[PDB]
Scaffold this active site. Sequence first.
Site, PDB file in Angstrom:
ATOM      1  N   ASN A 192      -7.380   9.383  -6.338  1.00  0.00           N
ATOM      2  CA  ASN A 192      -8.191   8.455  -7.114  1.00  0.00           C
ATOM      3  C   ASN A 192      -9.121   9.201  -8.079  1.00  0.00           C
ATOM      4  O   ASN A 192      -9.345  10.407  -7.935  1.00  0.00           O
ATOM      5  CB  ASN A 192      -9.022   7.587  -6.167  1.00  0.00           C
ATOM      6  CG  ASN A 192      -8.168   6.817  -5.181  1.00  0.00           C
ATOM      7  OD1 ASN A 192      -7.256   6.087  -5.569  1.00  0.00           O
ATOM      8  ND2 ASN A 192      -8.456   6.985  -3.892  1.00  0.00           N
ATOM      9  N   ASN A 250      -8.874   5.493   2.705  1.00  0.00           N
ATOM     10  CA  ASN A 250      -9.562   6.281   1.670  1.00  0.00           C
ATOM     11  C   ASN A 250     -10.504   7.352   2.207  1.00  0.00           C
ATOM     12  O   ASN A 250     -11.248   7.125   3.157  1.00  0.00           O
ATOM     13  CB  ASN A 250     -10.311   5.336   0.732  1.00  0.00           C
ATOM     14  CG  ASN A 250     -11.096   6.073  -0.327  1.00  0.00           C
ATOM     15  OD1 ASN A 250     -12.303   6.251  -0.201  1.00  0.00           O
ATOM     16  ND2 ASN A 250     -10.413   6.508  -1.373  1.00  0.00           N
ATOM     17  N   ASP A 256     -12.331   9.141  -8.390  1.00  0.00           N
ATOM     18  CA  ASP A 256     -13.627   9.560  -7.848  1.00  0.00           C
ATOM     19  C   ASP A 256     -13.532  10.802  -6.956  1.00  0.00           C
ATOM     20  O   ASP A 256     -14.509  11.183  -6.305  1.00  0.00           O
ATOM     21  CB  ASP A 256     -14.314   8.404  -7.101  1.00  0.00           C
ATOM     22  CG  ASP A 256     -13.628   8.061  -5.793  1.00  0.00           C
ATOM     23  OD1 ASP A 256     -12.496   8.538  -5.577  1.00  0.00           O
ATOM     24  OD2 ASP A 256     -14.212   7.311  -4.984  1.00  0.00           O
ATOM     25  N   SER A 311     -11.415  11.066  -4.396  1.00  0.00           N
ATOM     26  CA  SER A 311     -10.852  10.696  -3.100  1.00  0.00           C
ATOM     27  C   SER A 311      -9.327  10.582  -3.144  1.00  0.00           C
ATOM     28  O   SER A 311      -8.706  10.592  -4.214  1.00  0.00           O
ATOM     29  CB  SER A 311     -11.471   9.390  -2.580  1.00  0.00           C
ATOM     30  OG  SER A 311     -11.064   8.273  -3.355  1.00  0.00           O
ATOM     31  N   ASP A 334     -15.944  -3.886   8.857  1.00  0.00           N
ATOM     32  CA  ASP A 334     -17.072  -3.385   8.061  1.00  0.00           C
ATOM     33  C   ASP A 334     -17.908  -4.514   7.473  1.00  0.00           C
ATOM     34  O   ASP A 334     -19.085  -4.332   7.160  1.00  0.00           O
ATOM     35  CB  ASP A 334     -16.567  -2.467   6.932  1.00  0.00           C
ATOM     36  CG  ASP A 334     -17.692  -1.892   6.081  1.00  0.00           C
ATOM     37  OD1 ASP A 334     -18.697  -1.414   6.652  1.00  0.00           O
ATOM     38  OD2 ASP A 334     -17.564  -1.915   4.833  1.00  0.00           O
ATOM     39  N   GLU A 392       0.812  -1.219   0.000  1.00  0.00           N
ATOM     40  CA  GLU A 392       0.000   0.000   0.000  1.00  0.00           C
ATOM     41  C   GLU A 392       0.849   1.275   0.000  1.00  0.00           C
ATOM     42  O   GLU A 392       0.614   2.182  -0.803  1.00  0.00           O
ATOM     43  CB  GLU A 392      -0.983   0.007   1.190  1.00  0.00           C
ATOM     44  CG  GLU A 392      -2.129  -1.022   1.093  1.00  0.00           C
ATOM     45  CD  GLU A 392      -3.145  -0.695   0.005  1.00  0.00           C
ATOM     46  OE1 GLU A 392      -3.104   0.429  -0.558  1.00  0.00           O
ATOM     47  OE2 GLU A 392      -3.982  -1.568  -0.299  1.00  0.00           O
ATOM     48  N   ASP A 399      -6.115   8.350  -0.941  1.00  0.00           N
ATOM     49  CA  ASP A 399      -5.736   7.340   0.054  1.00  0.00           C
ATOM     50  C   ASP A 399      -4.584   7.906   0.882  1.00  0.00           C
ATOM     51  O   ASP A 399      -3.664   8.490   0.337  1.00  0.00           O
ATOM     52  CB  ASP A 399      -5.262   6.057  -0.639  1.00  0.00           C
ATOM     53  CG  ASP A 399      -6.383   5.289  -1.314  1.00  0.00           C
ATOM     54  OD1 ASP A 399      -7.568   5.539  -1.020  1.00  0.00           O
ATOM     55  OD2 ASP A 399      -6.070   4.402  -2.136  1.00  0.00           O
TER      56      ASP A 399
END
Length: 129
Positions: A46, A59, A48, A50, A101, A35, A52
């Site tokens: 990213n 995110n 969209d 966003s 989650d 990562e 990270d």
Amino acid sequence: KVFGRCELAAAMKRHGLDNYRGYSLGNWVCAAKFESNFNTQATNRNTDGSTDYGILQINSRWWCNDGRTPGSRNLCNIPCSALLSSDITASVNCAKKIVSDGNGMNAWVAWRNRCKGTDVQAWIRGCRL
Ligand SMILES: [Cl-]
Ligand SMILES: [Cl-]
Ligand SMILES: [Cl-]
Ligand SMILES: [Cl-]
Ligand code: NA
Ligand code: NA
């Protein structure tokens, strides 16, 4: 900062990640390697809107608030900037929420593609924790 492999393993174990929600410590170390390359300050944007953030590339669409991401949910209730600290506490606390989650560690794309299905115990081998 940039962690060494065993250095991060030790820190992650102190922070209670070993076997957390069914994921052994090597999973978390491998995730961090692919990562962020063990760098607490890594960031990646990213498509969209966003970004990270940090050692575990958390995110900003779902988990942390960076004030500039549409549809933000801030489910970890933490500013994204705190996830760039050299101290991994905030990132680990958020990671624990993420892995809880209901889809395990699959939220970590680099873990999913490059760690899952390999012998992840190798990531803590030799560390004598
Ligand atoms: Cl392991
Ligand atoms: Cl922020
Ligand atoms: Cl730390
Ligand atoms: Cl925190
Ligand atoms: Na703990
Ligand atoms: Na990847």
